[PDB]
Each structure stands twice: as C-alpha cells, then as structure tokens.
Design an enzyme around this catalytic site. Sequence first.
Site, PDB file in Angstrom:
ATOM      1  N   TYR A  59      -2.418  -9.285   0.134  1.00  0.00           N
ATOM      2  CA  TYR A  59      -1.520  -8.674   1.098  1.00  0.00           C
ATOM      3  C   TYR A  59      -0.931  -9.760   1.973  1.00  0.00           C
ATOM      4  O   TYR A  59      -1.583 -10.755   2.241  1.00  0.00           O
ATOM      5  CB  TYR A  59      -2.293  -7.692   1.978  1.00  0.00           C
ATOM      6  CG  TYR A  59      -1.486  -7.136   3.124  1.00  0.00           C
ATOM      7  CD1 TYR A  59      -0.664  -6.021   2.951  1.00  0.00           C
ATOM      8  CD2 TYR A  59      -1.529  -7.738   4.390  1.00  0.00           C
ATOM      9  CE1 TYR A  59       0.099  -5.508   4.008  1.00  0.00           C
ATOM     10  CE2 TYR A  59      -0.765  -7.236   5.463  1.00  0.00           C
ATOM     11  CZ  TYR A  59       0.040  -6.122   5.258  1.00  0.00           C
ATOM     12  OH  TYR A  59       0.773  -5.635   6.312  1.00  0.00           O
ATOM     13  N   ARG A  76      -3.759 -12.318   3.050  1.00  0.00           N
ATOM     14  CA  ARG A  76      -5.132 -11.881   2.807  1.00  0.00           C
ATOM     15  C   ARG A  76      -5.364 -12.033   1.319  1.00  0.00           C
ATOM     16  O   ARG A  76      -4.417 -11.939   0.535  1.00  0.00           O
ATOM     17  CB  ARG A  76      -5.355 -10.407   3.156  1.00  0.00           C
ATOM     18  CG  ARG A  76      -5.086 -10.018   4.593  1.00  0.00           C
ATOM     19  CD  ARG A  76      -6.039  -8.901   4.951  1.00  0.00           C
ATOM     20  NE  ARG A  76      -7.404  -9.365   4.697  1.00  0.00           N
ATOM     21  CZ  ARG A  76      -8.462  -8.582   4.512  1.00  0.00           C
ATOM     22  NH1 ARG A  76      -8.326  -7.276   4.538  1.00  0.00           N
ATOM     23  NH2 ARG A  76      -9.664  -9.110   4.283  1.00  0.00           N
ATOM     24  N   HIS A  95      -7.995  -7.733  -2.318  1.00  0.00           N
ATOM     25  CA  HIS A  95      -9.218  -7.047  -1.929  1.00  0.00           C
ATOM     26  C   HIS A  95      -9.114  -5.557  -2.127  1.00  0.00           C
ATOM     27  O   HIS A  95      -8.017  -5.012  -2.314  1.00  0.00           O
ATOM     28  CB  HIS A  95      -9.535  -7.316  -0.456  1.00  0.00           C
ATOM     29  CG  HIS A  95      -8.447  -6.869   0.474  1.00  0.00           C
ATOM     30  ND1 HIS A  95      -7.244  -7.533   0.584  1.00  0.00           N
ATOM     31  CD2 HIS A  95      -8.320  -5.740   1.212  1.00  0.00           C
ATOM     32  CE1 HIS A  95      -6.422  -6.834   1.345  1.00  0.00           C
ATOM     33  NE2 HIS A  95      -7.051  -5.740   1.737  1.00  0.00           N
ATOM     34  N   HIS A 152     -10.606  -1.900  -0.392  1.00  0.00           N
ATOM     35  CA  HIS A 152     -11.259  -1.244   0.729  1.00  0.00           C
ATOM     36  C   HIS A 152     -12.195  -0.116   0.283  1.00  0.00           C
ATOM     37  O   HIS A 152     -11.925   0.608  -0.696  1.00  0.00           O
ATOM     38  CB  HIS A 152     -10.208  -0.628   1.657  1.00  0.00           C
ATOM     39  CG  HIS A 152      -9.370  -1.633   2.385  1.00  0.00           C
ATOM     40  ND1 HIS A 152      -9.759  -2.200   3.577  1.00  0.00           N
ATOM     41  CD2 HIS A 152      -8.140  -2.131   2.122  1.00  0.00           C
ATOM     42  CE1 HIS A 152      -8.807  -2.998   4.027  1.00  0.00           C
ATOM     43  NE2 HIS A 152      -7.811  -2.974   3.166  1.00  0.00           N
ATOM     44  N   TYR A 158       0.855  -1.183   0.000  1.00  0.00           N
ATOM     45  CA  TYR A 158       0.000   0.000   0.000  1.00  0.00           C
ATOM     46  C   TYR A 158       0.892   1.233   0.000  1.00  0.00           C
ATOM     47  O   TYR A 158       1.946   1.253   0.650  1.00  0.00           O
ATOM     48  CB  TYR A 158      -0.871   0.080   1.257  1.00  0.00           C
ATOM     49  CG  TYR A 158      -2.045  -0.876   1.303  1.00  0.00           C
ATOM     50  CD1 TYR A 158      -1.856  -2.259   1.444  1.00  0.00           C
ATOM     51  CD2 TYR A 158      -3.348  -0.393   1.192  1.00  0.00           C
ATOM     52  CE1 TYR A 158      -2.958  -3.137   1.471  1.00  0.00           C
ATOM     53  CE2 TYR A 158      -4.438  -1.244   1.221  1.00  0.00           C
ATOM     54  CZ  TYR A 158      -4.241  -2.622   1.361  1.00  0.00           C
ATOM     55  OH  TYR A 158      -5.353  -3.447   1.401  1.00  0.00           O
TER      56      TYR A 158
HETATM   57 FE   LIG Z   1      -6.166  -4.271   2.871  1.00  0.00          FE
END
Ligand SMILES: [Fe+3]
Lengths: 309, 309
Positions: free
Chosen positions: B198, B219, B222, B224, B162
């Site tokens: 992630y 994860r 995805h 957000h 990110y």
């Molecule tokens: Fe996330």
Amino acid sequence: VKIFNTQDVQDFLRVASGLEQEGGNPRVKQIIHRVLSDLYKAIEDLNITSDEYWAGVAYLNQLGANQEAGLLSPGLGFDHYLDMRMDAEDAALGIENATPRTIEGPLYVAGAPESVGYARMDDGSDPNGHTLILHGTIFDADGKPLPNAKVEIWHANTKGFYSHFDPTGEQQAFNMRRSIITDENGQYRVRTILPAGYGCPPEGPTQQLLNQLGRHGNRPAHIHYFVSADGHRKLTTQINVAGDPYTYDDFAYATREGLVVDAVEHTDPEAIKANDVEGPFAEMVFDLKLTRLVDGVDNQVVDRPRLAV
Amino acid sequence: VKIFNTQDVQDFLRVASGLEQEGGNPRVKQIIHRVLSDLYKAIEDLNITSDEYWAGVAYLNQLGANQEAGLLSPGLGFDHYLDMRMDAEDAALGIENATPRTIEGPLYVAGAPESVGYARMDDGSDPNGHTLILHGTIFDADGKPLPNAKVEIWHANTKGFYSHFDPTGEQQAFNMRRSIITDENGQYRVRTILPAGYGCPPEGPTQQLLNQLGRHGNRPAHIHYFVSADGHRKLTTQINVAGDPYTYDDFAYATREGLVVDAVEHTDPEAIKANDVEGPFAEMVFDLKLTRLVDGVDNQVVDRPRLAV
Ligand SMILES: [Fe+3]
Ligand SMILES: CCCCCCCCCCCCCCC(=O)OC[C@H](COP(=O)(O)OCC[N+](C)(C)C)OC(=O)CCCCCCCCC
Ligand SMILES: CCCCCCCCCCCCCCC(=O)OC[C@H](COP(=O)(O)OCC[N+](C)(C)C)OC(=O)CCCCCCCCC
Ligand SMILES: [Fe+3]
C-alpha cells in the site's frame, strides 16, 4: 503504564520525526519531533485510551472537512496568544501601540473595490439593516493626519454572516467589504449597516468542541480593520459595538480596551438630512494611529492563507 | 520575549479550556487544557512565527478535507505506540500474547459476506492477480483448535487499493474482504490473490508532510485480521509477506516478529489439483492464538469510527 521514558519510545520518536533521515525540512522535523513527544507524553500522563484517541482523530477529520480549523484556532485562544506575543515583543522594543492590535479572524477576502475617502459598503439587501455611518481619521506615528493610508473594512450583516462565507446561499460579491484610501485630511468615511454578532455554526465541529468545554461560540457585533501606509507597519484590529452582550465575553477573546466604540443613534431631521440618509441611523467615529517600521521592516505582518476573489 | 509562564497566560489557558466553566465534560477539559498548554509552550520554545502557525492550521484543514487523519496517525507512530501501551498493560497483567497484535489501520469496513470454513475473497476482476491460498487454525486460550471463531480478513489488490477506498472505482463492494467462521477443526481457508504493498496517495496531505520529514509512505504487502470468539478477546493483527522490500521499513511501523509469513510458490500439477486451482499459486499458512477475557471483560477492544456498508 509508563513507557514514554524508555529508550524504545524515545528512539521511536526520533525515527518517526525523520530526525535520522537525510532529506526533508529540518525546521519541520524539529517542530514535529517536539509536538509528537509532547503528545506521546500527554497520552501517557492523562492515560488517554485508544477509544478516546480515535474520537480525537475523527474530530480532526470533521474539523478539516468543514474547513473550521481557522474558526477553532481563535476559539482555543491561539489567535489572541499570538497577539500577546506580538505585544510583548513591541513592548520590549519600546514601541508604544497607540491603537491596539487584535485578531484578524478567518474571514478576510482580498480584492474588495477601493475608493478614496468614501464608500457605501452594503448593497441594501439586508431587510433589517440599520444604516451606520462609520468614519474617522488615520494618524501616522507622529500623531499627524495621514492621507493615502489604505483602510480595509469588512463585517457581517444583521444575521452575523459575511459575504463569501454566507451559509444561506449568495450575497453580492464583496458585500460589506471595502478598501478606502484616506483623503487630504487623512480621513475615511463609509456608509454601511450595523453588524450583528457572529455565532459559530451550531452543528459545526468548533461548536461541538466548545460545548464539551461548557463554552458558547459567540462574538459581539464587530467591524474588522486592516490599515497600511508607507513607512508604517500594517495594523490589524477591530472595533466592538458598545453595549453588546458579548463585548467582554467573546469566544475569540479579541476584544480589548480602546477598541469598544459607541454607536450614537440619530433620529432628528437635521442630522438625517446633513448626512443625506433616508432615515434614522447610527454613527460611529474611530481613529487609528499607526506605528513606524522597525529598522525599515514590518516585524509583525502576517502572511497567512486568505481567500482572494 | 517569553510570556508563557506568566500569570496572564496561565489564567488564559484555564479560561480557554473551560476549567472554571460549570457545564461541559471535565475529561475533555482536562485533555484540552494539557494539549493547549503544551502547544502554547511549544510555540514559545521553538519560536514558531504566526506565518508558520497559520501554515499548520491550513494543513489541518486539508488533512481533514481529505479524510486522512487516520492515515497520518499511523505514519506518525501513534497507532503502534498505542499497541506498545496495550502490550505493556497485558504484560503487567501477566497475559502472554501468543499471536502479537499490531495496528488495525484505517481501512476496515464492516458488513462483509460471511461463510463457514472457506471463502473465495476476490472476484477475479484483477488482471495481474496471483492466486493465493491462505489458511490456518485458530487456537483458543488453552491451545486447542477453536471452531466457530470469526476470522475477518481484508487486504489490497495488486494495485495496492482497498475496496471502498479504491480511487479507480473498479472494485465491487467487499471485494477481498470476508468473514470466515472456523470449521469443526478450528480452521479457516481462503482463496484470494497476493496483495501488493500500500502507498499513501502521493498528492495527499499525509505524504506531503512525510516528504517534509524525508520519509516515504509505503507499507509492505500485508493482510489484515480481526479474530473474535466467545470467551476470548478480539485479536487485531496482520501478516507481512516475507521478502517484501518494506517489511522492515514500513511507514506505519506495524511489522513485528512472528507476523512475517512466507508465501510458498507451488508449481507442480499435483498441488494445483489438490487445491482446486487453475494453475501455479502461492500458499501462506498462519495460525492465530487468542487470549481469554479478563474477568469476562475484553480490556483491549477498540471502539473507533469504522465504515459500515
Ligand atoms: Fe492495510
Ligand atoms: C493525527 C494526530 C492527531 C492526534 C490528536 C491528539 C490526541 C487526541 C486527544 C483525544 C481527546 C479525546 C477526548 C474525547 C472523548 O473521549 O469524548 C469526546 C466527545 C464525545 O462526547 P460523548 O458524549 O462522550 O460522546 C458519546 C455519547 N454516547 C455515550 C451517548 C454515545 O466528542 C468530541 O468530538 C471531543 C473531541 C475533541 C478532541 C479534539 C482535540 C483536538 C484539539 C486540537
Ligand atoms: C486547532 C488548531 C491547532 C493547530 C496546531 C498548530 C500546529 C503547530 C505549529 C505548526 C507549524 C508548522 C511549521 C510549518 C512551516 O513553517 O512550513 C510548512 C510547510 C511549508 O513548505 P515550505 O516549502 O516551507 O513552504 C514555503 C515555500 N517558500 C519558502 C518558497 C515560501 O508545509 C506543511 O505542510 C507544514 C505542515 C505542518 C504540520 C503540522 C502538524 C501538526 C499535526 C499533528
Ligand atoms: Fe469578524
């Protein structure tokens, strides 16, 4: 809201704890599962909101970011609680602890210079340092002077700072930290200065939390000890300078009866000359008595992360 | 040896918690008293040794030193549990959440560029980037398209990093982070790239603990969302890219029915042109329905520390 007792939350706790996974450390999973269950239930009973929860999470980052987890621990009573358990355990074994144990604190540093029977611990850099002659005898489990015992001593200067943890830049390495091997008479003697009580960093997370509890973060002036010798268990203890305002109101709850010692002041020429000092000084005498190993082993030594220099 | 339920320990817990202290915050005291009690008891029930205890304290310092408390939290199920509590409370209030909520995660950043109806969120610096056209309609509490709603979207790049938390330091500020105000037709449309799953920093304290539980720290891919609008409660949710191996095995337990979305691959030139793209791309459609305030109050907004640049 009451969902803690449902199957969904109970099964979830097992999954989160890895109790279903095959890899991992079962002991860690056992502890994590219990701690998560208790916290999940505490969030439900106390109706902790997300806002409160995240404030707690932020505190936690801040605590570790300032490396104060080992400062908060004694402040919340854990360190002393662990000693109470150790005392209860010795009492059950019939072991009578002549010299009471108390907390180690998070400021021990391995590697201090050692010498036999005597040493000066300070480098005289503390402008307001008052000379202290600290000495005593080490006795074995039978009550006999014990030569060759290793007495480790560390304490703060008159500003409450320890070497290696002095927030105002440097102090010579191992300043006010020495290891002394007892002599032929089982005695140790050091020349250093009277320490001032330690106070938690005012703006640190430990003090922040203590303020929310209406508590201070101060410790009375004190001197740390580790005493080890063959055939005996390693003793961890401290002595508090008598008269300190926090003698009985220590934020780390480490003070104990039997560990409070008077610092006698000397100003007469005869005493000053006899201990070859340059002026008035304080004298403290403190003997320590050790306990024997339990079935050949030290059932109470603590192995914990300690700075080594 | 058991001492927890003795008077001495119980009294000590009240003292350490500041209960009989005049100053402080009673709410904090109440929570600290419950947590300490449970932990003192857990130490006794599971017979946690001083050695085990100090290893936990050390972990705590590194957790914070690495600012990972907000990463471990979701991995231990707290984030999802708090959502379960919110869902339970909404159900009790008779509120139907058309679009289910799920965790925010710890990587939201405030200050992203804002635009109306459309926005490109990536800067093209990502080499392996696959064009994604994500679009949808925002509906008010009555099922009508809602213009001027603020749709906030953030997600990772193809490397699973990110912006603002990218170890490689590649990304410019707010890359793949945008706020889109819905147009007259209550729609939002963005051009970005398919995020990659992630993974917790392998060397970080979160993953190290997860390894001890025999668990992974991944994860699924995805995206957000934060969606807010006047008269409505702020929606926190995310969508999962259908097909991802970790969709139903997310370490943060954030996956929910209704949030798994298919990424349609388009390859004919007719679609490439109608969408203004350079070549084949993926398309995902996701509409979100908001809930109305409860008597002018958003009973579920969470105010937690969030990075703002
Ligand atoms: Fe996330
Ligand atoms: C990863 C898993 C970890 C889970 C952690 C366990 C659950 C956490 C329990 C939550 C406790 C929350 C209670 C804190 C709280 O609601 O408010 C605490 C105070 C803030 O004071 P205020 O004046 O209200 O701030 C506002 C001032 N204004 C209004 C002017 C802006 O701040 C603080 O740091 C006190 C917080 C201390 C709690 C830490 C407990 C940890 C002990 C081991
Ligand atoms: C304010 C202070 C509050 C403190 C709260 C204290 C927590 C309560 C007690 C925790 C006890 C943890 C027990 C962990 C443990 O006994 O050993 C943990 C391991 C070690 O690995 P080993 O291979 O066994 O080491 C040994 C290798 N040899 C065998 C070769 C030597 O490593 C780890 O990271 C352990 C991580 C523990 C996680 C604690 C989580 C709580 C957070 C919600
Ligand atoms: Fe100390």
